[model samples]
Target chain A: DIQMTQSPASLSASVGETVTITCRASGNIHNYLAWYQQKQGKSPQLLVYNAKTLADGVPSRFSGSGSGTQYSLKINSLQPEDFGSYYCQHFWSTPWTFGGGTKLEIKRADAAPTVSIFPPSSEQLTSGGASVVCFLNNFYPKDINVKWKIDGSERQNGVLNSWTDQDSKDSTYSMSSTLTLTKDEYERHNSYTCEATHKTSTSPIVKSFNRNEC
Target chain B: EVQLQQSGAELVKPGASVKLSCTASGFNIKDTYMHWVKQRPEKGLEWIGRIDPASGNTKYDPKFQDKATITADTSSNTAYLQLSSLTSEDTAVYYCAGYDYGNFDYWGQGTTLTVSSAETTPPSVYPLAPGTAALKSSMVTLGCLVKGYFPEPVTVTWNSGSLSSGVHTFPAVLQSDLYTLTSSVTVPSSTWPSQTVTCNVAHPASSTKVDKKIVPRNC
Candidate 1:
């Protein structure tokens, strides 16, 4: 699969303004393209593809038109329901790639920033001499990297893997990553963090968990 | 009213797989493609792939690349999707989606599969090029086309961009040794350019709409 890069890591659009985001392929895709919309806590929905062809039931207000290595997803007269992150993906090859995603905010530029955590809670399990693996679900931005930290010291060496761009009726991109920790590390109730960052965004969003705690 | 009544859910153990089916009614089964999708529990929806009941050509989402298989039976107007390597993480609701004109237009109620310990099997569906093939100057035309589809309806127009006129001759019906309900249209040279000719198949299936365009060329 070729690398896919999306722009406008985030955006502010009014209720009726037209919002547009671009997805560029690292190489020619021969027009095998698709667009998806993902709202928080939901699955990504297929919006457009084959350049400008709309998926089965998408609305007319949402249109896509482009070709070759460059393609764009356009939402004409955005509605309140459209206020979410949008991602573009290329299905032309393996290692399927996705854009960094463009988020549509409600235009609350003056409100204080808020933070949200996932897995809201944690659970503990006996290691039994086997490595404990944690799968992080509903994550996005294929570029986001996963790492393991032990007692405040960065582990540095661990297998980090991720899946990109799954679609859902709600139109949100979801991914899963696995991290394996040693038995001793597992006993320590290792503190793990899955951080997703986009170069265009100012800060990285991290989801942390403590394996030892209930 | 066309309906896609899908099968019920399944419960399987880990390391095992499952297969599901979707049955279509109120329309010709061979006329469209049946698509399948996966929605992992609390996760996002994934496009597994689609199977053409008419030709049996299949396309996958790449993510599901080799993970799942899709098949269709035109005689029954039903399609099937099977997932392998059942895992707890694979537990989710699966749906059967369909399309008319290369666009998804209809979907069946999803079937939830709980992957626990066993493997489950589920049952069973191009673009084009230009030039090389030139239109004959003798005013002869041969082609097949569909008028409309349920769930969504699209208007078909002729090559001239309008309906055929002036002694337009169409085949009573085009029969495919493979599928049911196929139709075709034939035009003589006199009707060329005088009428807008195209086939519009409409689907009232989902929010997304589609319209396919076919143009005429002479060799």
Candidate 2:
């Protein structure tokens, strides 16, 4: 409903850097604003609301400050896990638009992940199919790709690219991708591969398996 | 933690069919609106349709205007999607998300409805038999009626101040055309006044419903 002049669309920052993103609303928004820490391919978590209230469970390093139409999100000594798109949204107008987004490049994908694949539990395979969950945990630079292959043939569908949950304690990220195949494919004993290509990897790490192994 | 427990992933051959069930808990089902969503690898989430379990009022996405069916059974506190005439495109994850404060906050874990290259309707419900109260020393019974339905089996329920069990009368010998049939629930006249009793004819025969409340106690 109101135009927001959001600046620094793409920001550059390193760990321990003081990063700030500001927004100016076209009209007085009554402090009804929310900032989001959104990752690609995942639900955006609320970071702050009312341009003042911080979301619960957020680290104390981040703060939402400013009043009315003059608000900004500030992160003190920003950490690696805080490296993602940050967005400011307003909830004061009838057709309040969503903030386009902000992309935070940690500028480092130094930490390689531990990756493995597991078949869906016996209780979970309700139908005749094979579904393997790829666990790519404790990695750096959340941007990564998980590709599925059947007997070395690429598959385009049936792959869920789940979002990563950052472990702020250790400053790492974990994500999963589940690949599925029909019962016939499972019975045929086709080797399914969950190849995770991390930005940090020389070659994609591959975890291969068949229904028989599970 | 409003949870909507969805049925497990389905793998049906192309041209086969499937029905998905979303059983919700952690909230009162009767007062909630259950919205079903679709997510195919092709794109992001798609809003299919939604049902008001309290009144059986349904509104669907025009994209799914004809391709899918969304219905709810408050008796079981569950909502269901009956997908038919399956094909490869229909193979997608179907989710039943709950709407609160104009947004879908509570979601069931996605239930993958796979075509496996295989695969897998709507309602206008109106209250007809209008409210009628016959006074006979309050031995008089009041009737709440509804008609025009299908997917046949309209589950009729009562919301009243009655201390007694209201009687369900088909009122007619047989139910043929939904229009020709009038479903009624009779409560004693003493219990009908000042106490509201609405005739809720739910989604039926694979149709969406927005119930029409007939005038009460005119007779």
Candidate 3:
């Protein structure tokens, strides 16, 4: 039952910069360490196994070096794709343990999303109700949330959320959310608002849809 | 098409011996190494040994060196694993895999072996421990470990509502004639100490449920 303690829980770096993450075992692991790389919302990929042997097809920029109870994963001239989480594990014995991950965040100016609200269309009204969609585009860091409110009360039932998709050219993210309103419910509610909240923004970006606007 | 057929289940008394068989089809057993792995009722796989049929060479995991014997009959294109001086701890499913250099290209249906005994032992559930701090992460992980159980196969769950999808239960591992298993679950860090999390364990051999609650705290 050896516990692995990792340092610098969270770090911020950028492309072309080199970063090193360290892991220390409670007891000597006899040079049986392995390092893994994990992107947001994806399974981990093995980068190095058996202390320093890099896995097949892994880039040469990724290197592992350590012995006994101490080990470190060093990324040289980090690429944009390397901005994710890294973990270390030991294969020396049972209860194979993993170190707390290091979040390698890209260092850059944060960007607030461009928010827009689309009113219900004639086609949507023909389907027994209306569907209001809100778009949040060109956001940075990918940790944005959307909330729906009808007349100042948070609406939980008819709201559909979406996952963010990154743009390859600029690394910005885009996402959208939909709010379904029944014919009767649509007539009963006068104001519909969608709020986009990001950690970088001073306040949530608010957009509204009105009955007459439709 | 390549295929692997394993022998049927066996029920034996303590101190007895058992031999399991695996027959290969559409592939020659003499060309590659045949590896044997052992898996207790609810435990992870344990490497037993491997045999090269053509050279009659054998390699055994040091832990199972004396307990398992690997043999192959190239004429029938079959591999065999024999367990000697069996006990309750030896009750598990054994599997045969055809190793293709670095990969296991084919596998056999596992053979079940039950070392039936009159006595049974119950597991002792340990308190939940706050796992390593996932700093700046969205979720926090908690672990529950159970030890010293006999006659494998236990059911476990989390009492937290609708959080079953977040639970990760590991297969049990045998040691000192007893078994130990661990389960972990992650919850939104925002709900930390305010949320109550409980782990419920059921051991069929003892016909009892052991429930342990985690007192949330900073690790």
Candidate 4:
């Protein structure tokens, strides 16, 4: 089995800028590499095959070059449609492993999220445990880190994060994080806070659920 | 619009063989190439082979050369894939695509091939998660992707009472001798983050019950 390591897992650049993504195979693939471009919720389309041969009808700006154990895909004068994800695959052997994948994002204006917190309902309180939610809505650039803390200590046992969903109308992204606790633990904990950090702002947006508030 | 109509699903006994069909419309089969691709449960797409309908010449990915045979009926604008000497590993959803020169421009609805065996395998349940596409108003869909089980019959339940009104369970599909499918439940977006939902799966063949809870976290 060949392991492929892709560089700069995520890349952000403006339209018209030239960008390059590299893939390094654990063993020599001998120009058996292929490049693919995939949009969200769609099948990946082949762009380059046999290392440097561009698939027919692909733009001249898109090119691939590499040999042996290393390969790279370059997008010259990138277009808006080019912003998605890129992957490299090798057909040199059985299994034909794929790269980890690289996300190509377009530089754009950022928007801070409208953060809010919700408390558990009576029904949820009796279903073996209780749950609290932190909602981060309408954020731009679609990258944020969310944390759930109990009395200022980060908690992981009952924490889960939702996928970042892009709004159809505004294109801004929204996501939610939840914390579940046993009824006893919910009563024992005094404060639950949701802290969100994003590249758009240096300060973390904070929201809290206090037992006293209920 | 170009449409590719594929054959129906098949369930064959282990050691038997099956032939799948794909018929193209609105395009001449003799003008382009026909391709076949395979997908196993929880696995990536694998190119099997391609045929030139006009010339009857064919090229196959070395990995599938021994496992599959490709042919075309130009008179019917159809292509066929004959999988020989079937085994558990040969189970999968096979698809056919229409190609002009570079890439596949049109694809057929996949035909599933299930190779049943005497042994049993339990299903793997994924946590209840939000659907990618945001629905209109406040409604959203939650999905439970069940995979890698033998014998297609299985049951999926939601802990939050009966969601039958908005629940949809897809048909079971086969891959590498295992069955996989998804059951989805629609819920109000506001209720999603605050409530805990669990998906329970029962595999009668393996006599197992698995529960996957949605402990909300970002993906």
Candidate 5:
């Protein structure tokens, strides 16, 4: 097994500018290579692998190419909503290694860092009471520690939901902590917060919302 | 959509050390594993190791032993490799490979590492030319090479300064009485100049060290 290392530690790129990264091996790692993307408080999404082959569902602009020892990942046109952290992992062997961490902030070359929020969306509960679904878009590496809290209290055992990279990169992940509150609990405007903690960085991203309100 | 392309070409002298880099584009650098590999001059491929651009945990081949080190900067989605103990027999092309599930499927275009005359009183040492550097990201290729001795293994690393601190090493390639090794790294342009890259070589008869540096240049 070969060890892996990444550089720059962090970066800032404009919406149109490009971002790049490198992964070095301790020895010869044959053709067993894979790339992934991760957000502050979510799982890592697979990006590129086999030097060029793109995982299913990955954006077209995201591409990878190279062979036999050297390989890389590329993103064509950056988007305003593309602010977050990125990582690289190698599954070629055991004790899988990962890059330190890269925080891609919206380059202030012209405009301020754009902040967008995907508030927890409410869905008609088929199982009865009101239900809310929170979707964490564009997180990878699956290294973040996510927890669900109800009414300011940590819910040890709740119906939690999580998923791994299905189309982008190859990652192993699972989500838990979904709250199936009864009608009475729903009437109390039960507050649900999705808190995520990244292993590399100190700060954590927490998103909270009420279930009963529209 | 995201993509990663590494820089190409690296020339080093014997007795010195070298390091290569890889940059990515089109996608988030933090979400995946940055893999590394090696392909010697006219030799078969070899698996180095992988780094989580996130936690920085690493694993190396016993063959490499203490020849290389692997580390990364998630901010730029870039990875580094440093190599030590260079010798004439340690000359060949090295590369940075991307991996998933213990398999190297993707790769940089390849940065060639040519270890020539020894240091001091030797011919002009032409390190890899700093190709292109800009805020706008682009694809790059990288390659590594290890040669001469066998049984004893070789490794590579990427660094920003001295041979200590941030580094990653790979396993050794052994075949009967012969051994050849190669590998690569993929990084972004943000850490170009400040990043110090390296390649380390270890043999049974000699203490291991690095031989070259893949410094980013203006294209």
Candidate 6:
């Protein structure tokens, strides 16, 4: 179905603020609505859908509800991840339609994690196993967690260690974690993944590597 | 010259109905290659159907065939998509597009429709192209491709009545996103005549049986 009426090229709200964005259908849409959050090149994830149903894993703060020509997606409390793009869709008909996409962004006055992966030392590479050294630095609100994954699946046993650097001017954190894998496993699809998460991001910062050469 | 301007977004109650419009200008809307596409929030794009403006002959994805009604108006160079018995799953974005050599070249900006329901989408299977033809008395190979399902895997099988089902040219492996592909096998054409070769596809994620039938005839 063609978009009969869409508005608000974008939307911005302060953290913890409530916001609502609406979409008007040209035809009788029948309350078939869904909402999504998308940023950059990532796949959009469902939030509020089915007119009033919240998708699984979605926080209660997000919701969808409306009848007739106007439908709205309301975020009860703004979140850091809420600062991206939000769009409305309906399944009432094929040739589906989406709004101009409401972009919700908040000032990063908080802070996002800066991440990097250190190359292996010659000694470590020469050894039997592969050692991965991933660091998350210069992040505020020092509450962050780092996890290791093999081919997108989380790995339970990796020597995990974290420390805070109170001495830094901003009172931030520069944390590091190391994971060791047998040479055979490393080459056999256990390509490493380092994921860092905090309340500030809509999603985790994931850095993965398949070091076939090593 | 080609142009497509779609309408805005929409909101509705379940069990209601909605009709959308796409206006075409600059280039005539009579082009037989015009089509509509459907996309959900985080789902793959789908082909809703196509229109032959001159006769209004329509071809739709089985999923949308019953729920979607397509129409074209040559008087004003416009197209329409109307959906009924809306539910939460019916809510999604719709678009009008025209193709360029198997490519959807230009598309009208999409329209979003809101319906409150759990998304239950069936798998999509791409059709296979015909295989290379063989001269009489030589070996022949058949090929087909299948894909689009959940749960990480799609299965493909090939069959024939009498010709020895020799090893295939490997398999039409899934190239990420659960797409399946399989290529040729060397079989004698001496016995290939009047043979009905088939490709059967099975997947837990599909709502339909996927198959391909190739009838080899004497040249």
> Which lDDT tens digits does candidate 6 get at residues B123-180?
4332222122232326544443332333324555667333334423222222222322
CAPRI-style docking class of model 6 based on DockQ: incorrect
Best model number under TM-score: 4
lDDT of 5: 0.49
lDDT of 3 by residue, B88-110 (tens): 77887787877533223466767
| Regions of candidate 4 where Cα sits further than 4 Å from its true position | A126-129, A165-171, A200-203, B1-219
Better lDDT candidate (2, 5): 2
Docking class of 1: incorrect
lDDT of each: 0.53, 0.59, 0.70, 0.72, 0.49, 0.59
Q: Write the per-residue lDDT of candidate 5 for residues B1-219, one digit (tens) a residue.
A: 444566655656667787778777655445666756554532333445667777787766555546667778878778776767766555544555554452223456666565655222111111222212211344232223343343333444544234432121223332322333333333444554446555444343444454655543322
Q: Write the per-residue lDDT of candidate 6 for residues A1-214, one digit (tens) a residue.
A: 5463445655545779999888898877787766766654343556766678776577898888888768888888887667667777665665455566765544324566655443333333355555455555556555688888877788777343444332224434445565656555665673666888987787998765455433
Give, for candidate 1 chain B, the lowest lDDT window spanning 10 residues: B121-130
On TM-score, the stronger of 4 and 5 is 4
Write candidate 2's Cα lDDT for A119-161 as tens digits.
4433223445445555566677666888888788888776654
Query: Using DockQ as the measure, which candidate wins?
Result: 4
- TM-score, cand. 1: 0.47
- Model 1 over residues B1-219: C-alpha lDDT tens digits? 777777766766667767788899877667876778676533445566788789998877677876889888888888999888876566677877665345544667778775543222110000011111112333333222221122112232334345453112221111111110111234544554354344433223323323333243221
RMSD to true structure for each model, in Å:
26.7, 24.7, 19.2, 10.7, 27.7, 22.7
User: Which runs of model 6 end up more than 4 angstroms from their true locations?
Assistant: A1-214, B100-104, B116-219
For candidate 4, write residues A171-194 as lDDT tens digits. 566666657677788878888888
Worst 10 residues of 6 chain B by lDDT: B169-178
Candidate 3 per-residue lDDT, tens place, A1-214, comes to 6767876677778789889999999989987787767665443456788778887568999998989999999999989789877877665654346677777775556789756555454443555766665656667867788998888999877665454334445656666565767777887877888899997777898877566542
Candidate ranking under lDDT, highest first, comes to: 4, 3, 2, 6, 1, 5
What is the alpha-carbon RMSD of candidate 1 to the true structure?
Answer: 26.7
